[PDB]
Every structure is written in C-alpha cells, then in structure tokens.
Amino acid sequence: PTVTMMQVEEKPDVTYSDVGGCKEQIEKLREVVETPLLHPERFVNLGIEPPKGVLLFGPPGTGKTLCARAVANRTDACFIRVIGSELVQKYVGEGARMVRELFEMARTKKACLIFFDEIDAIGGGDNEVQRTMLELINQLDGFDPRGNIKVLMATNRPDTLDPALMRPGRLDRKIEFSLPDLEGRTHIFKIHARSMSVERDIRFELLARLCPNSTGAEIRSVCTEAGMFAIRARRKIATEKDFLEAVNKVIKSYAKFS
Amino acid sequence: KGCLLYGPPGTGKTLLARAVASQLDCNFLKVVSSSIVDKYIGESARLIREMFNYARDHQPCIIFMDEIDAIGGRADREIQRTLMELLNQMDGFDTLHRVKMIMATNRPDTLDPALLRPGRLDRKIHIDLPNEQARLDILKIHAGPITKHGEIDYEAIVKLSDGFNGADLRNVCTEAGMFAIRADHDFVVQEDFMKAVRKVADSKKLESK
Amino acid sequence: LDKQIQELVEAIVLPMNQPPKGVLMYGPPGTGKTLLARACAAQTKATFLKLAGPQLVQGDGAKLVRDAFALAKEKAPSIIFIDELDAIGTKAGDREVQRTMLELLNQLDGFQPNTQVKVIAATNRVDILDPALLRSGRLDRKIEFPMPNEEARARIMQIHSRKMNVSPDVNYEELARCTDDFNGAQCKAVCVEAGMIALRRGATELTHEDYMEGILEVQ
C-alpha cells in the first residue's frame, strides 16, 4: 500500500558531529551501525550472535538527532525509520501484515537495517497492542527476517515491562542519555555554524560557558530563538550581543520552572 | 441440601468424597476456600451470586467446601458477608431444591454455630482415627486394582505407617506404584513400596501441617 | 542440584529416549528454573516450544490446550515447557480458566494415546495447587529446590559459558567466590557483561580477568 513506497526514506539529513556531547557513548552506538556495515562476515566471524544494535531511553533531549545521524552515515542506499504510530491503529489486523511486509522488504533489500521509533506507543484492554508487541518480539526473536541487521529503540519512557523482560535475550548495549560537560556543546556549535548567520565575532566557547545544564534540547532552543528572533528582529546577521538576551532568556526563563 | 463431615480425630473424608465424586458425582465442580480471601476490593458477594447462580441454573450440582476452619472465624468482615449470603441462600426465599453442597472442616470449635444450625448443616458424621487394623483392611481393599509382585508383605507397610492420612496412604502407595512403573515392569516389587512410601510419606510428615 | 536435574532429565528423556507424563517443576526463587529446564532442553536437543502463564487468558485457553496437544499429536516429539500455572489456576474469568484446567485434566485422564509428546509445567509457588492433579498422566514429578551454591553457579554459568570463546585459564574459584548473593540472571549479566567489551578490547577471545571485571563492573 502507501506505507510501502512511503516508508522508504530518502533525502539524507543531520550528520555525525551533531551528537550532544557523547565521546564514548557515540562509539558505543557507532560500533554497531558503522562497523558492521563495512563488512558482514567480520562480526559473523567474530564469534557467536553478533550484536544487533543499541538501546536509547531516558530524557528526550537531543532525540531524533542521532537517528538522523544514522541515516546520514548510510554510505550506499538510504535507509528507513519505522515510526511507532503506524502499528497501533484502528481496524486491527493491518499491523501484522505491515510489520511482515516491512520485514519482507528487509529481506528483499539485501539485509536492510530497520529502526524503531517511539516504542512506548506499542509498549506496555491492550490485547490489540499485545498483538503488535508480542508478534513484534515474536518476529524479532524469530530467525526468519534476519538476526544481525539492526535494533534501535528511541523512546522517552523505559517503563515497558514486557519489552524490559524480553529485551535481555536479544537486545543489548543499553546506554543512558549521557548529558554533556561544559566542553561538549561547542561541537554542536561548530556543526550548527550553518545556522542563521552566526557572525565570526561570536565565540562558541563563550556561548558554551554562558549556559550550564544546556543539553541538546536547550541549545537546540538556543538555535530556535536564535534564528527565530533573528527573523523577527528584521536583521540578517546574528551577533552575540544582539541575541544573548534570547540565549540567557531561553535558558533562564525556561530554566526557572523546569 | 446440606451435610457436614468433621473428622478431627483422624481423616478419611477425601477417599469417600473423592471415591464417589470420582465415581459418578452426577457432575463435577469444586469450590476451594482460596477463592474468597479477595485480596482486591471485596466484591465477592456478586461472585457468590454469580457462581451459585450458575449452580442453580444447572440442575445437577454438588459443591464441596474444604478447609473451612481458617475461613470460619467466630478480613473476617467479607467472610461474614459471604456467610450472610450463605444464610440467605441456604434458607432464603430462593430456588433451594435438589442442588446439594458439602462442607468439610478440622476442628469442632470455630465452626460458626450460626452455620451449625440445622438447614445450613443437616447431617454431621464424626470420623474416627485410622486404626492399624483399619489401615490393613483399607490397604487390602485398595490393593485390588494395583498390581504387585508375588512377594508381598503388608507388615512393613502398615507397621511403618503410624499416624498417617488415609488419602495420603492411597496417594503415597499409588505414588510408589507409579515410582516402580518408571522402569515399565509389569510386576511391582514391594522394595520401591518401602522406599517411595517411606520417603514420600516422610515428606508428607514434613508437609503434614 | 544434581539429583533434581537427574530426576528432570530422566522425567523428560526416559520417555524420549509406563513412561512419565507430567512434571511439576517448582521451588523457591533465585534458582533459575526456566533456564534450568532450558539448559535441560539444551541437552534434549528437541524443539523447545515456549509457553507462558497468561497466554491461556486472551474460551481460548482450551484452544491453546488442544493446539499444544495437536502439535503433541502430530508434531515431532518436541519439548513444550509451560510456566506460571498457579497464577492462572487460581482456585468470572478465573472460573473459565478452571474450565480450561478441567479440560486439560480430562484430556490427561481420558486419552490413552497420551504416551506421545509431554508438557513440562513450572510454578513459582505451590500454595494454589489443584488437588485433582494426582495421576500418572497428570502432574506427578513434584520436586523442591534447594538453595544454590557457588559451585552450582559455576555449573550453570559453565553451561551458559561453554560455547563462547573463553581462554582456558578459569579456576572458577575467584569468580565463584566473588559472586555472592547473586542469581542466575545476574551471572548472565556477569558473562554477557564480559562479552560487552570483547569488541573494544580487540581480543576476540574472552579472558580470565573479564569475568571478575564484569562482577566489579556492573555488580
């Protein structure tokens, strides 16, 4: 149906160095998306049951940016990102054929990688959801589609009990959000220097040290009010003295209650 | 429409009610005392009306009640509520006909003298202790359908059985027959009877509470 | 823990290689009865057909009983391992699962061809137990579990760490002594945790100090 040709995702997007400051965790989740892609036989010959992928949970923060990074680091054929809102729908019975036809497309596309977004929508009456998650794990643990390509869960709450007790068998490499230190934000600054006319007088270390506890969501809002108040001020160039009030406003006025 | 089987000295009601209930019983439906503790909200009233409602919708019906001594306190508020449903549904205005219920207990002291009233419990039979001679005769009339080897000796089985349960006597003796049938021998020697009857019977002394 | 794995391996292998029909695998928690019966399945080599407790609750439990006994009727002699039977057999849905239960006992009572594939039952507690389960065809093998020791933890961790590339220098006494107040799945966190950094260490073969480095790493 429309989900077949619509599901295939093209037009690549945000890259590697937009990571929210993780130096070791970016290797802990990079050595399963980039290293197995360079050769299949390598991790097959590395022993028994090569790792499928990683696990992302906790606070949203810089979410959906590292998955866009995984889409960007695709070297040969642009990959896909299954969304969670398509499995739980009205008129049950189409989610099974949906996951079996997208896993069948994974079989057809020479060991294609699959990513699962918003697992909390199908995680955790709920018998129509138990079909999608019990049949979903029944197809992941099954050796029919593939057992080496990719697993990656990106969600907000790890409060899904059944996937938490079914995950240690097949899923592996769970990591936290790993909030950055003071020096981590300047990488996101150096890569987002394509933003709305960052002047060369703007120092990225000054902007980094002027905002503590400012994980990728809060500096992404620094960029949101940066370009937004750059458009609303009828200006065309951005100067740190022109939007520092928007910076400390967007971090302090939004850091008071939250 | 009511009867009581209290056997405080000894036992033997399980072989009777399981012998006839296993023979015909005219039906099959067991109600255990653990379906009433109701750890959640105490809505067991509609469970009594629903389950007994099906027990009256079905014309043939016989209900057993085992281990009522702990749920027969003279937590107890919902117990006495279901006992008010037992009064109003044993001697009430309902369809209280042929359908029959049977109560079993252990001690004749906390037996809810409101339930000990006639109607709620018409008959009562005081079971006695299983005598060594009664154990020998019950083991001879229960030794019929089970196969044994030509070498037989009931003196060790009856002698080594002191203060045991008759239901546990039959289930432990037949448990020893099933212990000796593991090696698919048509003949059953009494060596495995001494072994499995002794060990499993001592396990029923550990679990004889 | 050897006489009960011998009693279980006999209970499910002497009919596989009157034979026993039912087995009640219970005991206190912390042992790993599901992975002990699955470790037994690793020795039987037959197909391991998993089934959970609340899978009967979806008049469908009788359909899963007749389905497991249809696969038992025609399907090759696999190993059906059900678990958490006391939670669904609570002695109006629970009464429907009691009808499923009495149909299960009726099919394990009135059927002579029951010498085929068996069903292994596991419970975490025997407080809720059907008194009508006293039959050769029904659940017969009632085994209690003792407290495991560090030697038995080295046994199950050796069955669970026998296929991986482990260096042949393991005294099992440093790691067996360091694993205190642990369980089976936590020793699986130990061995899998030792398998985590096997990629970034570069050495594709597991070493000695990685077990105790996992114990001190996550636990």
PDB file of C-alpha atoms in Angstrom, chain B residues 2-150:
ATOM      1  CA  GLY B   2     -26.628 -29.778  53.422  1.00  0.00           C
ATOM      2  CA  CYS B   3     -24.199 -32.002  55.316  1.00  0.00           C
ATOM      3  CA  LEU B   4     -21.053 -31.768  57.430  1.00  0.00           C
ATOM      4  CA  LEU B   5     -18.094 -34.180  57.555  1.00  0.00           C
ATOM      5  CA  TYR B   6     -15.879 -33.348  60.541  1.00  0.00           C
ATOM      6  CA  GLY B   7     -13.099 -35.836  61.235  1.00  0.00           C
ATOM      7  CA  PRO B   8     -10.966 -34.102  63.903  1.00  0.00           C
ATOM      8  CA  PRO B   9      -9.508 -37.401  65.196  1.00  0.00           C
ATOM      9  CA  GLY B  10      -8.072 -38.997  62.066  1.00  0.00           C
ATOM     10  CA  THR B  11      -9.049 -38.473  58.451  1.00  0.00           C
ATOM     11  CA  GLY B  12     -10.705 -40.301  55.554  1.00  0.00           C
ATOM     12  CA  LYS B  13     -13.245 -37.893  54.015  1.00  0.00           C
ATOM     13  CA  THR B  14     -11.083 -37.360  50.915  1.00  0.00           C
ATOM     14  CA  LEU B  15     -11.220 -41.038  49.943  1.00  0.00           C
ATOM     15  CA  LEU B  16     -15.003 -41.044  50.426  1.00  0.00           C
ATOM     16  CA  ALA B  17     -15.906 -37.813  48.626  1.00  0.00           C
ATOM     17  CA  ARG B  18     -13.164 -38.416  46.053  1.00  0.00           C
ATOM     18  CA  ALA B  19     -14.252 -42.048  45.658  1.00  0.00           C
ATOM     19  CA  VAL B  20     -17.892 -41.222  44.918  1.00  0.00           C
ATOM     20  CA  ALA B  21     -17.114 -37.860  43.312  1.00  0.00           C
ATOM     21  CA  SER B  22     -14.568 -39.719  41.183  1.00  0.00           C
ATOM     22  CA  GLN B  23     -17.107 -42.492  40.532  1.00  0.00           C
ATOM     23  CA  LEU B  24     -20.097 -40.539  39.239  1.00  0.00           C
ATOM     24  CA  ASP B  25     -20.757 -37.350  41.264  1.00  0.00           C
ATOM     25  CA  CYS B  26     -23.536 -36.685  38.699  1.00  0.00           C
ATOM     26  CA  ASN B  27     -21.407 -33.643  37.793  1.00  0.00           C
ATOM     27  CA  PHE B  28     -18.024 -32.068  38.526  1.00  0.00           C
ATOM     28  CA  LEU B  29     -17.467 -28.683  40.184  1.00  0.00           C
ATOM     29  CA  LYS B  30     -15.094 -27.843  43.055  1.00  0.00           C
ATOM     30  CA  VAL B  31     -15.106 -24.646  45.127  1.00  0.00           C
ATOM     31  CA  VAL B  32     -11.875 -24.071  47.060  1.00  0.00           C
ATOM     32  CA  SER B  33     -11.598 -21.846  50.140  1.00  0.00           C
ATOM     33  CA  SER B  34      -8.810 -19.798  48.492  1.00  0.00           C
ATOM     34  CA  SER B  35     -11.169 -18.072  46.020  1.00  0.00           C
ATOM     35  CA  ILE B  36     -12.724 -15.977  48.809  1.00  0.00           C
ATOM     36  CA  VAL B  37      -9.764 -14.232  50.513  1.00  0.00           C
ATOM     37  CA  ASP B  38     -10.304 -11.459  47.928  1.00  0.00           C
ATOM     38  CA  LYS B  39      -7.048  -9.501  48.251  1.00  0.00           C
ATOM     39  CA  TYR B  40      -8.539  -6.860  45.930  1.00  0.00           C
ATOM     40  CA  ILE B  41     -11.749  -4.892  46.546  1.00  0.00           C
ATOM     41  CA  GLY B  42     -14.172  -7.125  48.420  1.00  0.00           C
ATOM     42  CA  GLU B  43     -16.716  -7.662  45.638  1.00  0.00           C
ATOM     43  CA  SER B  44     -17.045 -11.397  46.384  1.00  0.00           C
ATOM     44  CA  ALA B  45     -20.794 -11.007  47.008  1.00  0.00           C
ATOM     45  CA  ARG B  46     -21.577 -10.878  43.286  1.00  0.00           C
ATOM     46  CA  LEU B  47     -19.112 -13.746  42.849  1.00  0.00           C
ATOM     47  CA  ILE B  48     -21.259 -15.820  45.213  1.00  0.00           C
ATOM     48  CA  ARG B  49     -24.449 -14.710  43.450  1.00  0.00           C
ATOM     49  CA  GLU B  50     -22.885 -15.439  40.051  1.00  0.00           C
ATOM     50  CA  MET B  51     -21.275 -18.792  40.875  1.00  0.00           C
ATOM     51  CA  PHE B  52     -24.256 -20.038  42.880  1.00  0.00           C
ATOM     52  CA  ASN B  53     -26.474 -18.538  40.170  1.00  0.00           C
ATOM     53  CA  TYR B  54     -24.813 -20.901  37.697  1.00  0.00           C
ATOM     54  CA  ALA B  55     -25.005 -23.652  40.331  1.00  0.00           C
ATOM     55  CA  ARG B  56     -28.797 -23.203  40.338  1.00  0.00           C
ATOM     56  CA  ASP B  57     -29.101 -22.708  36.581  1.00  0.00           C
ATOM     57  CA  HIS B  58     -27.502 -26.138  36.293  1.00  0.00           C
ATOM     58  CA  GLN B  59     -29.969 -28.652  37.720  1.00  0.00           C
ATOM     59  CA  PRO B  60     -27.386 -31.304  38.725  1.00  0.00           C
ATOM     60  CA  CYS B  61     -24.919 -29.647  41.087  1.00  0.00           C
ATOM     61  CA  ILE B  62     -22.780 -30.776  44.038  1.00  0.00           C
ATOM     62  CA  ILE B  63     -20.389 -28.351  45.739  1.00  0.00           C
ATOM     63  CA  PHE B  64     -17.546 -29.204  48.114  1.00  0.00           C
ATOM     64  CA  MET B  65     -16.011 -26.943  50.761  1.00  0.00           C
ATOM     65  CA  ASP B  66     -12.604 -27.943  52.143  1.00  0.00           C
ATOM     66  CA  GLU B  67     -10.574 -26.319  54.937  1.00  0.00           C
ATOM     67  CA  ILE B  68     -13.303 -24.061  56.333  1.00  0.00           C
ATOM     68  CA  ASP B  69     -11.678 -23.752  59.775  1.00  0.00           C
ATOM     69  CA  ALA B  70      -9.490 -20.790  58.789  1.00  0.00           C
ATOM     70  CA  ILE B  71     -12.362 -19.015  56.996  1.00  0.00           C
ATOM     71  CA  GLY B  72     -14.750 -19.754  59.852  1.00  0.00           C
ATOM     72  CA  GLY B  73     -13.779 -17.096  62.376  1.00  0.00           C
ATOM     73  CA  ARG B  74     -16.337 -16.525  65.126  1.00  0.00           C
ATOM     74  CA  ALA B  75     -10.548  -9.766  56.737  1.00  0.00           C
ATOM     75  CA  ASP B  76     -13.416 -11.515  58.525  1.00  0.00           C
ATOM     76  CA  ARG B  77     -15.987  -8.861  57.558  1.00  0.00           C
ATOM     77  CA  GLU B  78     -16.249 -10.056  53.952  1.00  0.00           C
ATOM     78  CA  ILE B  79     -16.122 -13.635  55.243  1.00  0.00           C
ATOM     79  CA  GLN B  80     -19.191 -12.921  57.372  1.00  0.00           C
ATOM     80  CA  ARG B  81     -20.741 -11.125  54.387  1.00  0.00           C
ATOM     81  CA  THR B  82     -20.403 -14.229  52.218  1.00  0.00           C
ATOM     82  CA  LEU B  83     -21.742 -16.142  55.227  1.00  0.00           C
ATOM     83  CA  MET B  84     -24.764 -13.830  55.202  1.00  0.00           C
ATOM     84  CA  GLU B  85     -25.156 -14.774  51.545  1.00  0.00           C
ATOM     85  CA  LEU B  86     -24.825 -18.385  52.707  1.00  0.00           C
ATOM     86  CA  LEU B  87     -27.664 -17.897  55.194  1.00  0.00           C
ATOM     87  CA  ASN B  88     -29.881 -16.018  52.728  1.00  0.00           C
ATOM     88  CA  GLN B  89     -29.022 -18.557  50.005  1.00  0.00           C
ATOM     89  CA  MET B  90     -29.299 -21.725  52.108  1.00  0.00           C
ATOM     90  CA  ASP B  91     -32.521 -20.905  53.997  1.00  0.00           C
ATOM     91  CA  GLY B  92     -33.782 -17.938  51.967  1.00  0.00           C
ATOM     92  CA  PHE B  93     -36.629 -17.484  49.501  1.00  0.00           C
ATOM     93  CA  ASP B  94     -34.635 -18.820  46.533  1.00  0.00           C
ATOM     94  CA  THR B  95     -34.991 -21.934  44.343  1.00  0.00           C
ATOM     95  CA  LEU B  96     -33.321 -24.009  47.088  1.00  0.00           C
ATOM     96  CA  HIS B  97     -34.087 -27.502  45.737  1.00  0.00           C
ATOM     97  CA  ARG B  98     -32.223 -30.726  44.802  1.00  0.00           C
ATOM     98  CA  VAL B  99     -28.854 -28.937  44.388  1.00  0.00           C
ATOM     99  CA  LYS B 100     -26.536 -30.026  47.196  1.00  0.00           C
ATOM    100  CA  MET B 101     -23.450 -28.696  48.985  1.00  0.00           C
ATOM    101  CA  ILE B 102     -20.930 -30.427  51.259  1.00  0.00           C
ATOM    102  CA  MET B 103     -18.741 -28.788  53.915  1.00  0.00           C
ATOM    103  CA  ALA B 104     -15.516 -30.156  55.412  1.00  0.00           C
ATOM    104  CA  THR B 105     -13.518 -28.937  58.405  1.00  0.00           C
ATOM    105  CA  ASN B 106     -10.911 -29.927  61.007  1.00  0.00           C
ATOM    106  CA  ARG B 107     -11.820 -28.595  64.472  1.00  0.00           C
ATOM    107  CA  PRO B 108     -15.331 -28.523  66.005  1.00  0.00           C
ATOM    108  CA  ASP B 109     -14.759 -25.291  67.924  1.00  0.00           C
ATOM    109  CA  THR B 110     -14.716 -22.445  65.357  1.00  0.00           C
ATOM    110  CA  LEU B 111     -17.473 -23.990  63.220  1.00  0.00           C
ATOM    111  CA  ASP B 112     -19.724 -20.894  63.120  1.00  0.00           C
ATOM    112  CA  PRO B 113     -22.618 -22.073  65.347  1.00  0.00           C
ATOM    113  CA  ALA B 114     -24.862 -19.998  63.082  1.00  0.00           C
ATOM    114  CA  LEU B 115     -23.787 -22.366  60.297  1.00  0.00           C
ATOM    115  CA  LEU B 116     -24.042 -25.317  62.702  1.00  0.00           C
ATOM    116  CA  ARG B 117     -27.799 -24.671  62.792  1.00  0.00           C
ATOM    117  CA  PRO B 118     -29.953 -27.318  61.071  1.00  0.00           C
ATOM    118  CA  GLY B 119     -30.713 -26.451  57.476  1.00  0.00           C
ATOM    119  CA  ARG B 120     -27.313 -24.847  56.983  1.00  0.00           C
ATOM    120  CA  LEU B 121     -25.803 -28.190  58.070  1.00  0.00           C
ATOM    121  CA  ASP B 122     -28.320 -31.024  58.445  1.00  0.00           C
ATOM    122  CA  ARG B 123     -26.096 -34.076  58.929  1.00  0.00           C
ATOM    123  CA  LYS B 124     -22.782 -34.486  60.737  1.00  0.00           C
ATOM    124  CA  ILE B 125     -20.556 -37.579  60.861  1.00  0.00           C
ATOM    125  CA  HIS B 126     -17.661 -37.830  63.327  1.00  0.00           C
ATOM    126  CA  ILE B 127     -14.873 -39.703  61.542  1.00  0.00           C
ATOM    127  CA  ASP B 128     -12.563 -41.727  63.793  1.00  0.00           C
ATOM    128  CA  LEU B 129      -8.845 -42.477  63.676  1.00  0.00           C
ATOM    129  CA  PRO B 130      -7.458 -44.868  61.045  1.00  0.00           C
ATOM    130  CA  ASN B 131      -6.669 -47.972  63.083  1.00  0.00           C
ATOM    131  CA  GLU B 132      -3.752 -50.244  62.228  1.00  0.00           C
ATOM    132  CA  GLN B 133      -6.281 -52.992  61.500  1.00  0.00           C
ATOM    133  CA  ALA B 134      -8.399 -50.473  59.589  1.00  0.00           C
ATOM    134  CA  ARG B 135      -5.243 -49.416  57.735  1.00  0.00           C
ATOM    135  CA  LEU B 136      -4.575 -53.064  56.866  1.00  0.00           C
ATOM    136  CA  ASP B 137      -8.121 -53.681  55.625  1.00  0.00           C
ATOM    137  CA  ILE B 138      -8.271 -50.389  53.714  1.00  0.00           C
ATOM    138  CA  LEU B 139      -4.906 -51.285  52.159  1.00  0.00           C
ATOM    139  CA  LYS B 140      -6.280 -54.714  51.196  1.00  0.00           C
ATOM    140  CA  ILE B 141      -9.475 -53.368  49.622  1.00  0.00           C
ATOM    141  CA  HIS B 142      -7.449 -50.589  47.963  1.00  0.00           C
ATOM    142  CA  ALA B 143      -4.709 -53.049  46.932  1.00  0.00           C
ATOM    143  CA  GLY B 144      -7.084 -54.661  44.420  1.00  0.00           C
ATOM    144  CA  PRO B 145      -6.734 -52.692  41.177  1.00  0.00           C
ATOM    145  CA  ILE B 146      -2.993 -52.082  41.662  1.00  0.00           C
ATOM    146  CA  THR B 147      -0.560 -54.796  40.600  1.00  0.00           C
ATOM    147  CA  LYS B 148       2.140 -56.271  42.831  1.00  0.00           C
ATOM    148  CA  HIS B 149       4.848 -58.919  42.775  1.00  0.00           C
ATOM    149  CA  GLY B 150       4.269 -62.391  44.180  1.00  0.00           C
TER     150      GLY B 150
END
